[PDB]
Amino acid sequence: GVEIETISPGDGRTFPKKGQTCVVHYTGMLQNGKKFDSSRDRNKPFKFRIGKQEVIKGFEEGAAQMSLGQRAKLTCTPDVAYGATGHPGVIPPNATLIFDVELLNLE
Amino acid sequence: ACFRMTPLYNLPTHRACNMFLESYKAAWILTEDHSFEDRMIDDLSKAGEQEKKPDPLHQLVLHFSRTALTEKSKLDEDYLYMAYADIMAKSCHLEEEVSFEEKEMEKQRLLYQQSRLHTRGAAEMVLQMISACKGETGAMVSSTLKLGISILNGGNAEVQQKMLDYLKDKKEVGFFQSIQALMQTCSVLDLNAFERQNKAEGLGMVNEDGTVINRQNGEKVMADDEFTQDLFRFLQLLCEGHNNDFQNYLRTQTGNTTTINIIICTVDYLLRLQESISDFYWYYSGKDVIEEQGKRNFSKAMSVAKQVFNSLTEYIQGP
Amino acid sequence: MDILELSERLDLQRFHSHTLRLYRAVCALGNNRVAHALCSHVDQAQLLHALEDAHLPGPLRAGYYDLLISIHLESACRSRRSMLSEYIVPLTPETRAITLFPPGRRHGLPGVGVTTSLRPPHHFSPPCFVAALPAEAPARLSPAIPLEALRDKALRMLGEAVRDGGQHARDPVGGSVEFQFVPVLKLVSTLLVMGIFGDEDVKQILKMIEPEVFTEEEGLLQMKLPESVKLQMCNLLEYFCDQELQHRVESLAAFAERYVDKLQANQRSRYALLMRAFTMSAAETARRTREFRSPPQEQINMLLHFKDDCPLPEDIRQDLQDFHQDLLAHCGIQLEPQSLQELVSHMVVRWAQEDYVQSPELVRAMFSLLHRQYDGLGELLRALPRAYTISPSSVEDTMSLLECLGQIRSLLIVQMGPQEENLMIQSIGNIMNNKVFYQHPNLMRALGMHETVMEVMVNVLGEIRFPKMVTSCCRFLCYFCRISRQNQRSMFDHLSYLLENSGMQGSTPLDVAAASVIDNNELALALQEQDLEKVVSYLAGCGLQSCPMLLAKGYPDIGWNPCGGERYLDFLRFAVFVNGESVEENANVVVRLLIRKPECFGPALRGSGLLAAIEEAIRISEDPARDGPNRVHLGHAIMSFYAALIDLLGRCAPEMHLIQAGKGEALRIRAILRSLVPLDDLVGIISLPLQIPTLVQPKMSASFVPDHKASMVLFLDRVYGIENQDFLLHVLDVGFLPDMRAAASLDTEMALALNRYLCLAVLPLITKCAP
Amino acid sequence: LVYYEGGAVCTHARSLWRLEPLRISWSGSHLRWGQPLRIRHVTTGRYLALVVVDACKAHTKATSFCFRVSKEKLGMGPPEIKYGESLCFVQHVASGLWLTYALKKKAILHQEGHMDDALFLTRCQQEESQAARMIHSTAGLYNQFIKGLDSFSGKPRGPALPIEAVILSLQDLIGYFEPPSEELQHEEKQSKLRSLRNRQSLFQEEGMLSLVLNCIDRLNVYTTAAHFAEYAGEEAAESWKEIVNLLYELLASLIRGNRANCALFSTNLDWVVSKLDRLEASSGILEVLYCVLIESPEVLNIIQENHIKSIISLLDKHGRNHKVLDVLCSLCVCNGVAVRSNQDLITENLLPGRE
Amino acid sequence: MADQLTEEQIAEFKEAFSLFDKDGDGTITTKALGTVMRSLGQNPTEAELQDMINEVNGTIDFPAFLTMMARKMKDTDSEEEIREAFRVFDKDGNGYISAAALRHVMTNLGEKLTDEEVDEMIREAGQVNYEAFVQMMTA
């Protein structure tokens, strides 16, 4: 349940490989549209290493499916992230998530 | 082990600095004297003059009066009030073969500093907190009585007239009961902890680079001494000018619901003192000579006895 | 809708104001797992945007400022403010160059300079919401926010406000002058206590208060202020006087390491001159009482006497007095407004002349500030017990200790649940193997660590909610009480409280009280009598009722307590017997009180035979039906209880040299103990043979132990005595030559339970009667 | 039965007795020795006879007592009987039987007597004794009102209960218990508080809390304000809406401030929260819950997730009431000590819907 | 009283204990206690090993380890302290301290002993030896 719909195309050839870091200037919503998160408000390019399962499963699977500089809209299903219980305090149980990411640099 | 004591240069330097601070504060900083207690109270009194509002000092004892009237079971030990209880107490101890005139100015300057407190309502603050004690013989009722003496020292008159009316419009039973409560919790000469101290006195220096702090143990027998002397010294000063109404108040609170008759309660401490000094005689009636610690105990019990006979006779100096 | 419309909506202003109270109350007191959860709902930029949008209404501005500190700058705030009252300085050379006055008698600027006292870092963690969920989690830190960006914004909003306030504008920011400054001071005050400001920043802050004084516009103190804005001025000014005091202590610590390094070489040169001096002998030992005959604590007390018989030269005895005059002049004593204490004493008194202040909080914060300046000497004194000095090689473990200290004080204020219990145990288990807790027992006492672990045992006892916690706390205190003797002296003082909760397996609060009085004649002599009668009243209960947990376990019923009552006599046998000797004053009052309630003795002798009582125990211990059916056998506890009632009274027997004197009181007691017990009851007990292990091993906790015999031999050898040769040889062949060759047989488990029994109980008593 | 007690029931409402001599006129003359009189309990309104008995069956032959000093074989008044000094006993004037004991030392008229019937009297206080007699005036109305309601408690309608008598009687009690103003002077505000702390402890001890709890639970069962009030008729039906609201105001006025009476709801906490959506006096019960959750902190940690889910369900059905956010702000901390069990039950319920 | 050890031993002990610490908990096995003392050069046999664990489950914790380390070094210093205590009396250091050179070294040490007790020390004991003096002091 990892649906990537493109928003702006990138290089088309540069892809992140394993054992590597990324820098994503992401933001997320819910299906109702309520904006539970961003990154630009914190003014920090969010970084993470692929493969090591730091992020949820719907995130890094969307991450290697992008090119460098591409802008993509993701749709992570309930079963791929925060399935039964959800995050405490933030994300309700059985919630489908909607993301807007952008691979800044470094593969 | 007294012979194997290591020298200072063998010690690590950080521990050497540690014992220095315990020494340097003890022999230099603690010994230092200064007289800031008078040059504070003037500007808290003079600043009411400016270009019916209360004075800076007059605001302060109003605030201490307000915290003594809130309904609480116990009286919480504020360090700040004890930090101000002695400072106002030392404003009168500067005045507390001579000519005739020069002692009157030494007298009247004490009535100046006594006026500098008790026209700002200092007389009823020290009367409320004894009712707010309700018998808990803690550290605050030590520090509140030294202020109560330095206002009524020398036998001032109108502070008693500022005190009788306060106990007559309020009908405050609870003062006199707290007076009666502090009376019974006055230690006397014992014959059990005395030899406990003496068996403790057989040790002079403790092993492993430690010192027996003789002030830590102190006097386990009659450590209540200077406090229980101070209460009767306060109690003597309520009828110093032979104010005959207190002679009929201290045995009968006739406006109140329940009399206490502290005069009778003063007798009953004296009897408890009387057997306690007499049994100290019977322990020493077999011994021939008296050592050093035996007299220091016996010097204590008569010094509080002279206080209470003097406090007795001011109930009856007036006819 | 636009949020500025709440300024006239006047109803959804209120309901969105009270929502901000629910936001501050949920993430209150360091709840940092939920503090990330709020960081989603109110973002980072829109909180920083709301700090300066001046058209916000009144009670909504004081919400969004106080929301900010309650999700970011509170969990770090309490932990550093806790470590401010204590001063821990290392010996770096940066410390070594610290003076009272700056070099250039001109009084230096407060809070400006270099301090060296240890403080833990803050450990923020950045928020995220796409990280995967694990799982018990260890902890959550406080969520982060960029501080170096924040200090420039906070200084700017203060810097305009002192300037715009001089303009006396009719439309102030946020609807008053009260809301213009109260939500900007209490952020600046809590960024000033966290120490994250540069010194050039607080140089600007000193200009923004009263620039006429602190210079190396109109001042803020001259501005007419309403009452609540004066309050944050006191909480701002209270930080500054402490930075004068912490600099003063760190000056005096710098002075001492320069001084005692100069003092050790002076002594060791003087001692070597004493080592080569043979010109005197009777006066030589008067010079030798100090060198190796006195303790080193008494050396420094004797060395430092030269104010108004000192072995120190006049060169290094004067610079101390030169230093001492540098410190009183640094304080308020002139020792015959350009000063901070000159400024405050003017400003605080003038505030009383302004109006009659009604808010009782401000009148306390005023006068506590004012007394702090005038008795500036005593303000230095009361901090000095919290002054300690460590080695620079120990700092890398000391700050690792202090962070593990801070988690406990954070758990002081939260009601204990099943998670933070595992935080407390893992904290405490990381303290007791940190190696500095031992080598500086004054410092652990100085930080109030021994006080802190007591109150978390107070709150749990108030049925026991969390027993696995309360063992490891009282285990920590028992391991604390034997580090130094004066630490045991401190723990002794909470005895009556510790005694009130004597009421299970594992350790107990009472074994804390036992290890507070052991091995020390000072405490045992100073032990109260009212603290003794409480111990026997809990001993008054156990002889009448059973253990309700044991009959809940399905055991047979026994009307008294062979297991519970033995948890007091092991305490009281430390109450009268110390250093292998009996006390007098406690022994003469425990037995006078033990006979007021004769139910306190075991009821078989209150009566059946004493050997018959143990004979009644062997059947119910050997038979499993009459035994307790798993760790508690009733038959093993009855012989163990009477092993406790015997050797207590043996250790209250008056000593022999007082029997040689005619002390009639001391021989009155020796009558009573001999009157209670028949001697021949002991002889059947001292001679009963045991199940020796050979080819099979019997059970220790269900059968006779040699420690049952070890209690009885101490009783007869201390109150009855061995007089003649026949009665010596009477019990000799019957008891011990059965056991000796039983011990000589195995030359194994109970062999070592009996080897130490023989070498500590009977072979002394043989050598007492060898002639 | 008559008893004795220590000091706890010495101060309270039970240990208050008034003397009633036989002669009508000049009854407030000075009492003298050898004088016949009756004995009244003030709260029950019963007459002492060695049992207490009702006034309708109190006879001058059955109950007539007297004050004698010791039994030798024997307008206004002269001042005969001092206070605290007389130390005199009681016995029947027809029987001569000395009331004495046997912690509840049961008092009995005994012809042997003892050496312990020399008992000293103490006069009561004016504000307290005024608070005494109104208990009897209210409870006599209230239990009459309860069993008046209990008559048709099962029988539908195809005596008259005191509707107008009870409406005015509550409203005087609200103003009796009204907390003093904040604009008052501080030394007098504190003095008037400790008077109020007595005379709500003086009610909740001697009944008058659960007695108020009863007349709620006989009335709350009629949720239709008219149709289930038609068991009475149309007369009491018009005043049913009022009598509930005034009742919760009384109870909220009782446990305001007082910590000791706030612990009296630690057993029936669930009785309170179960009536939050009752649609009549919804502010009334919510007022009672707010004052109890700020005085006694032990009622915080006895709250489970079934209770909090009703309160959020109250907010979702009663608008954006700003009082509901107060009681949740009291539910987080108590006395500066937070409850980590409660600080997450709110959060993962209220916040995550964002709606 | 655990203060009778100096700091650097506890520094050496914790260095030894953390070196054989099982998981960083501060637990060690019963065998490793023997190895770690032989890692510190101390070689006691299983007799001195056996009585120490039963004095305090197979799990040795660092305070439980350290209290045994205090007692093993308390008894050894308690007997070697008293011969070096006699060293300061005699000018040579053998045991021959003249009784004339004692009644000013004993009233000048700091336990505040007056002339009567240092008399009472002497006539209830020419030059006296050391072994009678360690007998007359320990008593």
Author numbering:
A (entry chain F): 1 to 107
B (entry chain B): 3634 to 3684, 3693 to 3737, 3750 to 3972
C (entry chain B): 1648 to 1751, 1758 to 1788, 1793 to 1873, 1923 to 2014, 2020 to 2047, 2091 to 2216, 2222 to 2262, 2267 to 2369, ...
D (entry chain B): 244 to 292, 299 to 323, 333 to 360, 372 to 427, 434 to 630
E (entry chain J): 1 to 56, 61 to 129, 135 to 148
Q: How did the manuscript describe this experimental structure?
A:
To gain insights into the binding of both classes of diamide insecticides, we solved a cryo-EM structure of chiRyR in complex with TET in the presence of the same modulators (Ca2+/Caf/ATP/CaM1234). After masking the transmembrane region, an unambiguous density of TET was visible, which also bound to the pVSD, with a local resolution of ~3.2 Å at the binding site. This confirms that both classes of diamides generally occupy the same binding site, in contrast with previous reports suggesting that they bind to different regions. However, there are distinct differences in how these two diamides engage the RyR. Third, the pyridine ring of TET, which represents a major difference between the two families of diamide insecticides, forms several interactions that are absent in FLU, including a cation‒π interaction with Lys4563 and π‒π stacking with Tyr4564. Ser4792 forms direct contact with the cyano group of TET, which might contribute to species selectivity.
The molecular target of diamide insecticides is the ryanodine receptor (RyR), a large ion channel expressed in the membranes of the sarcoplasmic and endoplasmic reticulum (SR and ER). RyRs govern the release of Ca2+ into the cytosol, driving multiple events, including muscle contraction.
